[PDB]
Amino acid sequence: ILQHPDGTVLKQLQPPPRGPRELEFYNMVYAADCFDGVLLELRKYLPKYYGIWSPPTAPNDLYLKLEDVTHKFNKPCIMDVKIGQKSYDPFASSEKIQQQVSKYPLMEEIGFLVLGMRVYHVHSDSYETENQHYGRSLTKETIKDGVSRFFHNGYCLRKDAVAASIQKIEKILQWFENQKQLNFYASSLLFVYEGSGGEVEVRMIDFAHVFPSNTIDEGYVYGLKHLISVLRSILDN
Numbered sequence: 001i002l003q004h005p006d007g008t009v010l011k012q013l014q015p016p017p018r019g020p021r022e023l024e025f026y027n028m029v030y031a032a033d034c035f036d037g038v039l040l041e042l043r044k045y046l047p048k049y050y051g052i053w054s055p056p057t058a059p060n061d062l063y064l065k066l067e068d069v070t071h072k073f074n075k076p077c078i079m080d081v082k083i084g085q086k087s088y089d090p091f092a093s094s095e096k097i098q099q100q101v102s103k104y105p106l107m108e109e110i111g112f113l114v115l116g117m118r119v120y121h122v123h124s125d126s127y128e129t130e131n132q133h134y135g136r137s138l139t140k141e142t143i144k145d146g147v148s149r150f151f152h153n154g155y156c157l158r159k160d161a162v163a164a165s166i167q168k169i170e171k172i173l174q175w176f177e178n179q180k181q182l183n184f185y186a187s188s189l190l191f192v193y194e195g196s197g198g199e200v201e202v203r204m205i206d207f208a209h210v211f212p213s214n215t216i217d218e219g220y221v222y223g224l225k226h227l228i229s230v231l232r233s234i235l236d237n
């Protein structure tokens with residue numbers, strides 16, 4: 001992800017088939033002639049899409065130009081959470097399924113995985129960051145405290161941002177409870193709150209494994225529900 005001062009990010013297409021799949025997802029949802037009620041509502045929860053972009057002198061080099069969801073913040077606190085019980089898709093080989101489950105074997109049980117976070121600490125005017133090994137090290141016993149960390153600014157727990165996050169997720173959940181045409185594997189929620197403010201973003205990202213479906217995305221729903229439950233518990237801290 002390249003942050004551009006114009007308030008967008010450039011995301012390089014991942015190798016095939018993942019990159020091409022994510023391109024077609026954005027093209028389907030943001031089709032200018034789309035009047036599918038499900039897809040028009042879905043746009044509310046995604047980064048705005050500005051189309052495919054490539055460097056003037058390098059048409060081979062494909063990017064997605066997306067809204068930078070962090071742009072309007074002064075000191076954005078950012079957390080990426082992968083949602084679902086399965087981070088492998090319906091076309092995964094036994095090898096790939098094993099590869100994916102082993103990356104985080106607790107995915108089925110918890111329904112979400114923290115990919116990383118960047119948290120502003122007020123007292124030091126500095127950031128603390130966690131990488132993929134943080135979330136992959138969390139268990140049922142430690143997930144509540146693991147998520148809580150995102151919302152602690154060194155001084156206090158930001159229950160305002162926690163409650164706001166629940167309210168934003170509930171709208172995404174409602175979208176999922178009212179559609180049976182897409183299932184999302186290995187996709188994420190991007191959480192942003194103001195570290196230096198009640199303003200909160202929660203947006204769906206990373207669509208390299210979104211597939212047409214005839215059923216509720218039950219894995220995604222389980223994950224959202226569990227994540228909401230954890231956030232709800234944190235409000236009692």
Ligand SMILES: FC(F)(F)c1ccc(-c2onc3ccc(-c4nnn[nH]4)cc23)cc1
Pocket residue numbers: 001003009011047066067068069070078118190205206207
């Ligand atoms: F923490 C960082 F590194 F500073 C960071 C991470 C993600 C973003 C970010 O802001 N808007 C996005 C929109 C989409 C994505 C994205 N899509 N797929 N993978 N990441 C990422 C986005 C911005 C900053």
